[PDB]
C-alpha cells in the first residue's frame, strides 16, 4: 500500500 498524495512523511497510513 502507498498513497499518491505527497505528504511530509509517506507510508504511515
Amino acid at each position, epitope marked *: 500500500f*502507498t*498513497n*499518491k498524495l*505527497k505528504e*511530509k*512523511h*509517506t*507510508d*504511515l497510513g
Partner: antibody
Amino acid sequence: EVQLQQSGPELVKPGASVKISCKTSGYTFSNSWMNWVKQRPGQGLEWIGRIYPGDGDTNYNGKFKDKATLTTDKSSSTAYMRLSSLTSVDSAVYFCARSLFDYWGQGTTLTVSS
Amino acid sequence: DVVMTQTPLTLSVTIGQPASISCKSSQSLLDSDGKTYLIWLLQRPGQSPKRLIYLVSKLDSGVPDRFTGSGSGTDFTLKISRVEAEDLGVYYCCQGTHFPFTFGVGTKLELKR
C-alpha cells in the same frame, strides 16, 4: 515485498566522486520518499538527505549539501546518490532508506584511499 | 539540529526480564500536523537497521508484542516486556519532525546467561 537493493562496494581515491544506486521493487516508486544515511564508527547514523521521486523534491542536511547530490530514474525505479570531493572522512557504509525509515537497503561500503 | 540523547548506552539484561530505553530530544517532536515523527530502530551486527516502532507507539509488521513505545514532547521510551535471545543489537531512536532528521547514538542490548 518492498525491496531496496544497493550497488556494490567502492574503493575511490581522495578527491574523486562516486555514485551509489538503490534499486527498488514491490511498491510504486514515485509515491515514497527515499532517504540516504551514512554510518561511520564514531559519527553514528547521519541523515544525508531525501528525494521524492514523484517530482524530484529534495531536502538536504546542511552538513552534506556541498558533498551529496540525490537523483532518481523513474524508468528503473532507482535512486542515486553522488558523493564528490571525497576524503577519508567519507569512508563509511551508506544506506538508502524509504519514507520514515521503514525499509532499508543492505548498505554500500565506501572506502576513500590511495 | 535536534539532538537525540539516548539512555542507557549499554543494557545488560537476563533472558526473560524486562528492559527499557529512553530518548530525549532537544526540541519537541510534536509536528504542526499533529503527528510525532519518532521511531525506534534495531540494528544487528553487519546488518541494516530495521524499524520496530513508529509514531511513538505503533508497531511495525512482524514485530513481537513484547515491544511497546510511549512518550510525548521531548521524552520517549522503548520497552521490552521480556528480552529474548534474538533481541540483541543496537537500538536507535530517530526523529523526522525537524530538518535535518537525526538519530540517537544507539543503545547496545547485551544478554546475560
